Design a binder for this molecule. Sequence first.
Ligand SMILES: *[C@@H]1O[C@H](CO)[C@@H](O[C@@H]2O[C@H](CO)[C@@H](O[C@@H]3O[C@H](CO[C@@H]4O[C@H](CO)[C@@H](O)[C@H](O)[C@@H]4O)[C@@H](O)[C@H](O[C@@H]4O[C@H](CO)[C@@H](O)[C@H](O)[C@@H]4O)[C@@H]3O)[C@H](O)[C@H]2NC(C)=O)[C@H](O)[C@H]1NC(C)=O
Ligand SMILES: *[C@@H]1O[C@H](CO)[C@@H](O[C@@H]2O[C@H](CO)[C@@H](O)[C@H](O)[C@H]2NC(C)=O)[C@H](O)[C@H]1NC(C)=O
Ligand code: CLR
Ligand code: NAG
Ligand code: NAG
Length: 1788
Amino acid sequence: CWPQLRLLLWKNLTFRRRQTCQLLLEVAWPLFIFLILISVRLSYPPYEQHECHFPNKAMPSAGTLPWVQGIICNANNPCFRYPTPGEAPGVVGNFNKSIVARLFSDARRLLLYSQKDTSMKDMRKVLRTLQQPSKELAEATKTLLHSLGTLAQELFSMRSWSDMRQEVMFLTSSTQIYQAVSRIVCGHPFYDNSTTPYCNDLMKNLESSPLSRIIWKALKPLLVGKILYTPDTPATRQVMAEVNKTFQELAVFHDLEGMWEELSPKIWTFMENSQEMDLVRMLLDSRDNDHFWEQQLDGLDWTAQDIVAFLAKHPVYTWREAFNETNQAIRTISRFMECVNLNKLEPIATEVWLINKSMELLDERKFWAGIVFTGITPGSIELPHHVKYKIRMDIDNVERTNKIKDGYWDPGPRADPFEDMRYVWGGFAYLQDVVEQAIIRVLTGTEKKTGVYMQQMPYPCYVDDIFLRVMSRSMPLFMTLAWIYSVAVIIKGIVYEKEARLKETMRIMGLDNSILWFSWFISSLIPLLVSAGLLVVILKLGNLLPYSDPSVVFVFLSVFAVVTILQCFLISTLFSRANLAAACGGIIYFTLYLPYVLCVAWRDYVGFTLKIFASLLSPVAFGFGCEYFALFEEQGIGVQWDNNLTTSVSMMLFDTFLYGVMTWYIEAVFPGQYGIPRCMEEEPTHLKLGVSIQNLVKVYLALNFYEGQITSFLGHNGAGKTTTMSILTGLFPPTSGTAYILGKDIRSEMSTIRQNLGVCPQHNVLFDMLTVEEHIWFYARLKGLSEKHVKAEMEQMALDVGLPSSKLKSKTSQLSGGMQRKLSVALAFVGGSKVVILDEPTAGVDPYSRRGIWELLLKYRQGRTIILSTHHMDEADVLGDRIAIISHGKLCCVGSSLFLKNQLGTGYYLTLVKVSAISNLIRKHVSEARLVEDIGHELTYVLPYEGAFVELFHEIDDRLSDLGISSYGISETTLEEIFLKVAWKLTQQQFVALLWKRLLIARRSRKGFFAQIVLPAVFVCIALVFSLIVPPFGKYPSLELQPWMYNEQYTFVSNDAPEDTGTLELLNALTKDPGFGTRCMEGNPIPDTPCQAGEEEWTTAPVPQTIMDLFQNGNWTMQNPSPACQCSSDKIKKMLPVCPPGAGGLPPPQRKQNTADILQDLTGRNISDYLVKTYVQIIAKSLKNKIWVNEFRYGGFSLGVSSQEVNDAIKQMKKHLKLAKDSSADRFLNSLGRFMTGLDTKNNVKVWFNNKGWHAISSFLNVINNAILRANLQKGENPSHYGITAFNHPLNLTKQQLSEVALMTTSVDVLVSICVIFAMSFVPASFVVFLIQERVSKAKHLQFISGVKPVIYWLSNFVWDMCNYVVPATLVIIIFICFQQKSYVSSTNLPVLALLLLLYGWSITPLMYPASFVFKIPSTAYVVLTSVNLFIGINGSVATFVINDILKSVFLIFPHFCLGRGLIDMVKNQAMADALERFGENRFVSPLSWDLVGRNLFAMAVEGVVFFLITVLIQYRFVDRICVGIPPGECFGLLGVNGAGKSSTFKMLTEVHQNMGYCPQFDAITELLTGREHVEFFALLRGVPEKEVGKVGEWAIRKLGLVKYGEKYAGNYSGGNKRKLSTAMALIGGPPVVFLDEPTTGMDPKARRFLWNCALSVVKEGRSVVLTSHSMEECEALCTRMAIMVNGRFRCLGSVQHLKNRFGDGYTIVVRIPDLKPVQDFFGLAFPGSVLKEKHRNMLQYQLPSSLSSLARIFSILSQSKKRLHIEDYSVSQTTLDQVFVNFAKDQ
Ligand SMILES: *[C@@H]1O[C@H](CO)[C@@H](O[C@@H]2O[C@H](CO)[C@@H](O[C@@H]3O[C@H](CO[C@@H]4O[C@H](CO)[C@@H](O)[C@H](O)[C@@H]4O)[C@@H](O)[C@H](O[C@@H]4O[C@H](CO)[C@@H](O)[C@H](O)[C@@H]4O)[C@@H]3O)[C@H](O)[C@H]2NC(C)=O)[C@H](O)[C@H]1NC(C)=O
Ligand SMILES: *[C@@H]1O[C@H](CO)[C@@H](O[C@@H]2O[C@H](CO)[C@@H](O)[C@H](O)[C@H]2NC(C)=O)[C@H](O)[C@H]1NC(C)=O
Ligand SMILES: CC(C)CCC[C@@H](C)[C@H]1CC[C@H]2[C@@H]3CC=C4C[C@@H](O)CC[C@]4(C)[C@H]3CC[C@]12C
Ligand SMILES: *[C@@H]1O[C@H](CO)[C@@H](O)[C@H](O)[C@H]1NC(C)=O
Ligand SMILES: *[C@@H]1O[C@H](CO)[C@@H](O)[C@H](O)[C@H]1NC(C)=O
C-alpha cells in the first residue's frame, strides 16, 4: 500500500521537476503580485492625528463684534490639541486679550465717565468766578484739582490707543504680518466698471496676497452679497426690516466721516485758543500742584512733564500728530466702508422671477442667499403661527442635499476649513440664525435677550490608515490570484493524466482511485504549503500586518489551500480536455469569488443563516476570515489565540467534506467516453493450462488456454472478444461463470490475480517528460520486484528491446511510432508476468517495426500464455498457434492454422502472370478447377481438394512458352476467407452550396453553440439594468432641516448656573409637550416620522462595580475627573484608543423625550472629557460586534448665562453740547447708541454639533431657535402649534456646472459601454472556432483539392458571417430599445447606433480571420480571443480617460475603441443638448457629423475592407525521377519505405483537379451535419446537375452501403462508417483517377472486404486507382502494378506475383505427422536449403530458398514420403509481399 504511494509521489515530483517551465512561473507570480502590493503599501504612510478641540463660532445674534471676530481669525479649525476655554461650561469668551475689545471697553468707560463727569461744568464755574485771595476760590481750586486728577487717571488707564498705534505703524516678514493681525483682531493660538477701482484693486490684492485665502471666501458674500425674497406681504416686509436693522447695526462707520468733518474745527479751536486749556496748562506747572499730580498719578506712566509736553504745545509728540493720525485713520476706514453694500435687500414678487433674478445676480457675481417664505395670501395677517421657509443659495457654497452622510464609516473629525465647512464660510448658518431671530422678535416682541454659539465636538486621538483597511478587507483577490495560477497548473496536470487513459491503466494494474486521489492531494498540497509559508513570511516582514502571529495565519492559509485543492478536485471531473480546463479554471474561480463582493455591498440586511447558506463556497468564507483579521488588526491589538474565525474554519471544513463527497459521486455517475457509469481440434495436453474458461455468459463459452503457445482470439468485436476479454480482466464481473486463471477463480480473488497478469490495451501508456529507463523502473516497482530484481529486469529489457544506448535510454518520449509501440508492448512483460493479454499490436506501424515486434513477442514465448486479439489476418496467422474464432457469443472453431485451412478451407490458389487456352488446359488437368478472377496482367484459379498436381505442374512447365504466361505462383487459403465463411454558373452553384451547408450546420446546432445569441442578449440586459440603478448625480431635492433624519442618536442638555435667572424657562420649554422641535405638535408636519408619544422616566442606567473604584479613587476634581487614556504609542499604531473602565466616570440620568431619541443630563460635568471618553468607548463597543459601526451622537445643548444706562447717557450727552438734528450729528450718535446696546447678551446657548452629520448644525440651530420661540411665548393657549421649519433647496445649475456634470458622467458612460463592447465580441468567436474546426485537414484543403476558387470560399464565409451577425444585432437593438434610454431610443440616435453596431461587426469579423490560420487546436481560441478583446476594451477605456489629437487619430484602427468612442460621444451630445434645452436654447448637432461620429464608421468600414484583403493575401502569400504510367484500370499502388514522403508526393501530384478524387487518411466529416447532405454538398461542388443531385446522392449512399444509417449525424458514426463516408466522397463526382490513402484503418472484417470489393469494381470499370498504406495484405489484395520507393526513386515495379518471385524468398512447407526424428532427418536430407523455422510436437515447418522452380519435384517427393514418413497433412505456400518489403527495407 505505502510503496505504491511512494511511487506515485515520486512520479508526481518527477513530473514537477522535469518541466522546468511551470514551477518558476509558479514561484514568481505570487512574489511579483505581493511585491507590487508592498510597493503600493510603502507609498501611503499611516496618517496620525492628535486629539484636539475647536474654537466656538459666534452667530450675528450674539453680537456684531464677536461675530466679526469669529469670522476673521479663528476660521480654520486650528486643532488646538488642548481644551479651549470656550468649551468650559461657564465662560463663552476666548477674547480676553483682544485689543479691539479692550479699545471698545475703554471707549465705553470714557463715555460713561464723561456723562457722569462734572469737571467741565466745575472748570467753567471756576473760570466765571475768577473772571468776575477769596474764600470759595480755594475750595473751587481743590475740587477742580481732584476732578482733573481723576480725568488724568481715566485718560491714562486706557492703554489701548498705544498698542493700536504701535501695531498699525509696525504694519506700515511674511509671518510677522500674520502675527500682527492675529494679535490685533483676537487672542493667540470687468469689475472696475461697476464700482470704484480702489477697493477693486484692494480685493485683487487680497486674492493675490500669499496667505490663507479663506477669509476672503467668507467675507465676499458678506460685504458684497445681495438677498431677495417672496412677495411683499406686510409681515414679510416687517421681518425683512428687522433683518435690515440687524444688518445696519454695524453701519456706524458710514456716518463717522461726516461727524469728523463737522467736529474737527471745533475741537481744533478748543485745543488751540481756549481759555480753559490755557488755565489747565497753567495749573499743570506750579510749585505745589506738581506734588498733587504725583500723588494722583499713583506712580503710573505719563507723568505731569509728559502731559505738559503733549498738551501744552503751541508751535516730541503733541496733539497735532494724534489729530492727523486720527484723521488719516478715519479717511482710510471711510474709503474702505464706501464700497460696502449694506443695502442688500430687494423685494421680489414671484418665485420664478426670484429664480431669474438670482441667476442674473449670479452672472453679476454679486449674490448672497435668498429666503423663500410660504405665505398663503398677501394679507395684513401677521403669521399663520407656523413659518415654513427655505434658503436657496449656490451649490458651491452649500453642502449637497442629495446625501446626508459619507456612507462608509472612516475616522476623522471632518473639520476641513474649506472642503466640508460650507455651512460656516458660505453664510448659510448666519442668514438662518438672523431670519429665525427676526421671526422670534416679530412673533412675540422680545428683541434679542439671547446669545447663540456653535461648538464642534472634539475627536479622540485617531489615526488614518484607510489603505490598511481597504487592503485587509479586500485580501482575497490578491491572496487568490497566485493560487488561481496554481490551480490552473494543477487542473491542467490532472486533466492531462485523465485524458490519456493513464488512470484507466492504473486501475487495471491493480490500483484504486483512493490512493491516486491521496497522492495527487499530497503532491499538490506540498508546494501550496511552501507558498503559504513564504506568503506568511512576506506579510509579517512587510510591516503591513504587524502583531499578527505567523502560526495562525499560516494555519489559515493551509486550510485555504486544502479547500481550494478539494475544489479543484471537484472541478476537474467535469472537463475532458487539458488546455480547455486549464483556461476555464481561472474564470470559473473568478465567478465563484464574485459572490463575496456581491454580498459585501449588501451587508446591511444579510442574515447569519443566509451567511451560512452562502458560505458553501471557499472564497466567501476566506473573505469572512480576512474581515475578522482586519477588524482585529486595525485597532493594533492584533489577532491571537483568544477562542467569526472559528465558524469560518468550520464552514471551510464542511465545504471540503462536501466537495469530497461530490467528487466521489460525480466520478462514478458521469464518467468519460471510456468508463462504465453505474470442428474442435484436439486439445494439446503436452503443456500446462493457464486460463481455463468454463461456461461464460453475460446479459444477452468455454476455452482452455495453454502455457507455451501464442493463442489467437478473433471475432466480430460485437459478438465477442470484447466483453469476453473484459470479463477475463477485472473490468466487469462474471455472470454465472468461472475461469481459474492459473489456479485462481476470477470471482474469488482479484488481488492475487492482478499480481501476475499483465495487460496491453490499444491505447499505449507512455508518460511524457520521462525516460524509457524511468518508465521501466516505475513499472517494475509497481509490479512488486525488489531493487536488484528490478535492475536485472531493466538490464534484460534494455538488451532485448534494441535501443541499448544512452542516446535513447536517457532521452524523452521522442522516438518514432515504431519504437514507441515496441516499448509500450514490451512494458506489459516487465515483472515476469506469467499471463499477458495483448490487444491490437502493431495497429498502424510500418511492416519493419511490425516484424521487430513479432520477434520481440516470439522471444517471450517460453511459457507466458500470450492471448492475441487483433483484426489483422496475417499477424494472427503467423503468430497464432491455436486460432479460436467465436460468434453469437458461442465458440465456433478452434485449432491450428493447418487444421483450420484443410478442414473447411478452400483449395489452393494458383496464379499466373502475363485466356481460353490456359483455362481449357487447367480444366483438362483438373476437373473441379475454375477461373476465380482475371485482372490486368494476372489470372487466378482455384484447386479445391492426388497425383493430379504433378501432371498439371509438369504440363504447365513444359508448355509455359505457349501462352503469355511469364511466371507461376501457388498459395494456400488465407485466414480471412475462413473468417468470412464461418461468421460560369459553377461559381454561383458553389456559393449556394456552401451557404446551404453552413445554414444547415447553424440550424442543427440548437444543443450546440446556440449560446452565442442569448448570452450577448443576457449580458446587454444585465448592463442596461445596472444602468438604471446609478442616480443621475445632478439632483438636489428640497431637504427639510430636522435632526431626526438620522435613525438613532444621543442628545444632551447641560444647564450651567441654575439660578432661575433666564435659563430655567428656556430649558423647560425645550423639554415640554412640543418636545425638541417640529416633530409632532397638533399633528406630524414631517413626512415618514410620527413621534412615539408615550415615555416619561427620569432614571439612571444600572451601573456595574465601577462606582466602587470611583469612590476609592476620590478627589476627582473638575480637572481630571476620569482616569486618563493612552493613544498611539511608539511602534504601536492604534486606530482608536482603548480606555480602562470608568471612562466617563458616571452614567448620567437617561430619559426619552418622545422623539425617538434619548437625552442625558450633563449638569456640572466636564463636557469635553465625558464626550471624548463616551464616544470612543461606545464606538469601540459597537465595532467589536461586526456591525459596520455608524455614528452614535450628533448634537446637544449647553445653556448658560454670560444696557439702557449707556443709551440714556448718550441721549443726555446729545441733549447738551450744541444739540442739533442734522443728518451728520444725530444719525451718528443714534447709530453708535444702537451698536452699543446691540452687543449685550443676558443668557446664551452653546450648540455642540458633530460635523460628520452633514445636516446636523443647521437642524440643531433650528431646534434651539424653535425652543427659544416657544419659551418667549407668553400667555399663549399652548406652545404646541408655534414653531418654525427651515428648508435647504439650492438653485438651478448653470452652464458651467452643466459642463461639469456632462464631464463627470463619462465615467458611467464608459462603464456601461465597456460591457456592451464585451458582449458584442462573442459573435465572431463562433465563426472563428468553426473556421478552426474546418481548417485542420477536415474540409479546407479537401475543398481546395476540387475546383472551388478559394477566394469564393472566404467570400461566402464573409457573406454568411455578415448575414448571421445581422440577427443578434437586431436582437440586441430591440432588447435595449425596449428600455426607455432617451440617449439611444431617440429618433435621431437610433439609426446612427444601428449602423454603428453593423459597421463594428463588419470590421470585427475579418479581424479574427487570420487568427485561425496559425492555430492547430480547436475549442480554445475562444478564451484567448475573448481575453484579447477584453484587453482592447480596457485599452479603449484608458484612452478615453486620457497628445490627445494624435491619440484619437491613430487609435481608430481598433473597432472596439471606435464603438466605445461612438457611444461616449453620442451620450455626451445627448446630455449636452438636454442641458441646453433645460437652459432654454436649441442645438441640433447631428451625431452623424464627420468630426464627431462617422469618422469611426468610415474607419471601421475601410478597416474591414483592408482586413478582408489582407486575409485573402495571407493565404496566397502574394523524389528521384518518379515515372509511372496509369492506363485505364490499373491499381498502381505506390508503397514506400518509412519516411519516403508519400504524403508530400501526394500533395505535390494533386481540369486535373476535377479529374482527381481524394480520400484523406484522417476522417473528415462535420460533427453536426447529416450523412446524405455530405455527399450532396460534395456532388454540388463536383459539378453535377441541380436535379440529378438527389439521384447522385442516393447512388453514393447505396453503393458504399450504410443505407440504414444514411440519415444521421456524421459525428455519431464509427470508424468504419467514417471511412465509408470518406471513400464515398471520392466517388461522388466520378473522376477517372481516384487517389486513395489508407482506406481501411481500424476497421473490421466483413467490412474491409466490402470496401475492397468496391475498389476492385471501380477498377474493373476502366478507372485506375492509386493507394498507399502499411498493411501489405491490402496491397497484395488490391494493387496490380506495385511501385516500391526505397529512397526517392521507384526501386521496383511490376505485378504482385512477378515481384514476389523475382526478389522474394523461397517457398514454405508445413507438415504434420509423439513424433519421430526420422521425419525431420529425411526432410533435411531431401532439400539442401531446408531451414527449421519452427519445431513443435507432431507439427513441423520449413523454408526452401532458391528451390522454388522445382515445385513439381517437391510435390513428387512429398507424395513419395507421404507413406514413408507417415505424414498426416502437407501444405506448400509462396512468399508473401510483406516478406519482400521487409527484405527490401533490411538491406537498405
Ligand atoms: C476637562 O478635562 C480636560 C482634560 O480631560 C481638562 O483639560 C486639562 O486642563 C487644561 C486645559 O483646560 C490643560 O492645561 C494645559 O496643559 C498644557 C500641557 O503642557 C504641559 O503640561 C504639564 C502638566 O500636565 C506640565 O507639567 C508641562 O510643563 C507642560 O506645561 C500646558 O502647556 C498649558 O499651559 C498653557 O500654556 C499656554 C502657552 O504657553 C499659556 O498661554 C497658558 O497660560 C497656559 O500656561 C495648560 O496648563 C491640561 O493639559 C488639560 N489636560 C489634562 C490631562 O489635564 C479640562 O480643563 C477639564 N475641564 C475643566 C472645566 O476643567
Ligand atoms: C435697509 O438698510 C439700508 C442700509 O442698511 C438702507 O439704505 C440706506 O438709505 C438710503 C437707501 O435707502 C441710502 O441713501 C443710505 O446710504 C443707506 N444706508 C444708510 C447707512 O443709511 C435702506 O433704506 C433700508 N431699507 C429699509 C426698507 O429699511
Ligand atoms: C486727539 C486726542 C486729544 C484724542 C485721542 C486720545 C489720544 C490722542 C491720547 C489719549 C490718551 C493717550 C495715551 C495714554 C497713554 C499712553 C501709553 C503710552 O505707553 C503710549 C502713549 C499713550 C498711548 C497715550 C497716547 C495719546 C493718547 C492715546
Ligand atoms: C478673561 O477671563 C477672565 C476669567 O478668569 C475674566 O475675568 C476676564 O474679564 C476675561 N477678559 C475679558 C473678558 O476681556
Ligand atoms: C429650475 O428648475 C426647475 C426644476 O424642474 C424648473 O421647474 C424651473 O423652470 C427652473 N427654472 C429656471 C429659471 O430654469
